[PDB]
Design a protein around this ligand. Structure first.
Ligand SMILES: *[C@@H]1O[C@H](CO)[C@@H](O[C@@H]2O[C@H](CO)[C@@H](O[C@@H]3O[C@H](CO[C@H]4O[C@H](CO)[C@@H](O)[C@H](O)[C@@H]4O)[C@@H](O)[C@H](O[C@H]4O[C@H](CO)[C@@H](O)[C@H](O)[C@@H]4O)[C@@H]3O)[C@H](O)[C@H]2NC(C)=O)[C@H](O)[C@H]1NC(C)=O
Ligand SMILES: *[C@@H]1O[C@H](CO)[C@@H](O[C@@H]2O[C@H](CO)[C@@H](O)[C@H](O)[C@H]2NC(C)=O)[C@H](O)[C@H]1NC(C)=O
Ligand SMILES: *[C@@H]1O[C@H](CO)[C@@H](O)[C@H](O)[C@H]1NC(C)=O
Lengths: 49, 49, 49, 49, 49
């Protein structure tokens, strides 16, 4: 994943569903600010403990 | 708030709204002992034929 | 393709933002049994998700 | 008229799966959740001989 | 009193969203996505509600 460089606080988010692992960033949408939007889906075999 | 799709961002980048397929509700006026009746379309100008 | 693995070692294929066609997929299947709970067997052929 | 696909060795499933505690006197039966994987998947190889 | 009339109307405008134990609040989606014999029961449940 190619992202830009800055000095702005941001947010990183890890979660999972039966679809697989879902990875979230705030850089893609609310880079001027702070939210949490979906940007990656990961085809895992099993849930992480 | 009522879980209805208010609007939509189309593939041309043009945002749109969608409300309903509103059709005119009709009432009927009827007279006993003089077999006469008539129809009323409320809240609408004389446009529906 | 490949080898169908065991029931406790099932392989899951996930699909998001693509196109399916069971007309060209279910035809090449020798289906012994076709059950669909909380859904019709024809719903997966037509309705989009 | 479809031979390109392969076939596994034999069908196999897990008839008993359990967790044994540290005391080795209390037994916990296992339950698999909706679209999840049992812990006994980590201990059973690809084929049961 | 004005808010009482407004919430009385919002009672009607809101309870269509409630499934009343059904799986979907759209009757057309119910009759499209389901087979007749169980969609009859689901429609009957939502009609009762
Ligand atoms: C560390 O220091 C750096 C720089 O010193 C900071 O970077 C700046 O951060 C501010 C704060 O977000 C940014 O300001 C934003 O500007 C947007 C408009 O800028 C556009 O237009 C100008 C030209 O007018 C362009 O130069 C620019 O590139 C943009 O194209 C606003 O729209 C933003 O407002 C949004 O967010 C605020 C909340 O922050 C809301 O109130 C608004 O309603 C709106 O949603 C915002 O104000 C600025 O662009 C950044 N500059 C650079 C060079 O990065 C870091 O933020 C700072 N980090 C920390 C942790 O302090
Ligand atoms: C996961 O890794 C562990 C660690 O090696 C594996 O456990 C070994 O399993 C073999 C049998 O296949 C035993 O002979 C070893 O003694 C085990 N070692 C340990 C440290 O537990 C385990 O089999 C692996 N599981 C999978 C599914 O790959
Ligand atoms: C992302 O970075 C890699 C490493 O330099 C580069 O090869 C690739 O082209 C970049 N992709 C984009 C979309 O910038």
């Amino acid at each position: 994943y190619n992202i830009t460089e800055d000095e702005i606080l941001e947010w990183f988010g890890i979660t999972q569903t039966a679809q697989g692992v879902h990875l979230f960033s705030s850089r893609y949408v609310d880079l001027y600010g702070g939210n949490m939007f979906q940007f990656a889906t990961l085809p895992v075999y099993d849930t992480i403990k | 708030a009522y879980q209805n799709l208010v609007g939509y961002y189309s593939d041309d980048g043009n945002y749109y709204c969608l409300r309903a397929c509103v059709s005119v509700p009709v009432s009927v006026i009827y007279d006993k002992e003089t077999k006469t009746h008539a129809t009323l379309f409320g809240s609408v100008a004389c446009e529906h034929i | 393709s490949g080898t169908p693995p065991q029931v406790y070692n099932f392989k899951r294929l996930v699909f998001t933002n693509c196109n399916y066609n069971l007309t060209k997929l279910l035809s090449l299947f020798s289906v012994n049994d076709f059950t669909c709970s909380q859904i019709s067997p024809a719903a997966i052929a037509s309705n989009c998700y | 008229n479809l031979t390109t696909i392969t076939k596994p060795l034999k069908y196999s499933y897990i008839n008993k799966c359990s967790r044994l505690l540290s005391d080795d006197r209390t037994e916990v039966p296992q339950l698999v959740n909706a679209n999840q994987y049992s812990p006994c998947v980590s201990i059973v190889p690809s084929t049961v001989w | 009193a004005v808010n009482n009339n407004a919430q009385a109307l919002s009672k009607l405008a809101s309870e269509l969203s409630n499934t009343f134990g059904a799986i979907s609040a759209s009757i057309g989606d119910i009759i499209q996505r389901l087979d007749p014999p169980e969609q009859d029961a689901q429609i009957d449940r939502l009609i009762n509600g």
